[PDB]
Structure formats: C-alpha cells, structure tokens
Design a protein around this ligand. Sequence first.
Ligand SMILES: CC(C)CC(C)(C)CC(C)(C)CC(C)(C)C
Ligand SMILES: [Cl-]
Ligand SMILES: [Cl-]
Ligand SMILES: [Cl-]
Ligand SMILES: [Cl-]
Ligand SMILES: [Cl-]
Ligand SMILES: [Cl-]
Ligand SMILES: [Cl-]
Ligand code: NA
Lengths: 14, 90
Amino acid sequence: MWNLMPPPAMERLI
Amino acid sequence: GPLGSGETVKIVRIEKARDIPLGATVRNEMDSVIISRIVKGGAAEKSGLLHEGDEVLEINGIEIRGKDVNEVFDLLSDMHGTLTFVLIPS
Ligand SMILES: CC(C)CC(C)(C)CC(C)(C)CC(C)(C)C
Ligand SMILES: [Cl-]
Ligand SMILES: [Cl-]
Ligand SMILES: [Cl-]
Ligand SMILES: [Cl-]
Ligand SMILES: [Cl-]
Ligand SMILES: [Cl-]
Ligand SMILES: [Cl-]
Ligand code: NA
C-alpha cells in the first residue's frame, strides 16, 4: 500500500 | 453535479491582523486552492465561516484559483484588515 497511494498535498498556513 | 463547479458561491468577510495569520491552512488540488485545517482560537475559527473543503476563488479582488499555495502563503502574509473571500463551499 505504501507505494500505490497518492502522497499528501502540501499544506500552507494563512 | 457531479460535473461542473455548481451554481453557488459564498462570500465571507473575516478580519485579519497585520503580521498574524488568520489561522487557516490551504492545499492545492491542481489549480484550485482548498481550505484544509483550522487553528484553534484564531480569527478563522472564531468567524465560523471557513471550513475544510471550501474552495477559495478570490480574496479582496485577487484571483486565487490557479495559484500554488506557496504563492498564497506569501500574499496573505502581506495582508490585513477586512478580507472578503469568494468561496465554493465544500
Ligand atoms: C485600520 C487602521 C487604523 C490601521 C492601518 C490599516 C492604517 C495600519 C496598520 C498598522 C494596521 C497597517 C500595517 C500593519 C501594514 C502597518
Ligand atoms: Cl506554512
Ligand atoms: Cl468537473
Ligand atoms: Cl449547485
Ligand atoms: Cl453558503
Ligand atoms: Cl492589525
Ligand atoms: Cl497586528
Ligand atoms: Cl488575529
Ligand atoms: Na508581510
């Protein structure tokens, strides 16, 4: 699983 | 629905202090900019008007859709006063 799953989206603080 | 971006927008006004983040985070889904998480006790939480999944189209006349969140981060760090967001609600 650790390889087909999409990675997390980058999150930024506003 | 499911196709197309729908028939509604939500406009919200939230007060931002100079050099203090509003207290919301954003991510990209391709061009779009989506509210992700909320800081406890911050201006966004207190307003009750910004929620996970809301898409930010514009803030104060600035087109936000299409920007990378790194760009949005820099822009918001230079803003203060009443911010008027145009959103597609989650
Ligand atoms: C609303 C007004 C009394 C404040 C101001 C916008 C004129 C000045 C400011 C101090 C809040 C702006 C800045 C942080 C950019 C210096
Ligand atoms: Cl950040
Ligand atoms: Cl679509
Ligand atoms: Cl709709
Ligand atoms: Cl609404
Ligand atoms: Cl201020
Ligand atoms: Cl301040
Ligand atoms: Cl604040
Ligand atoms: Na700044």
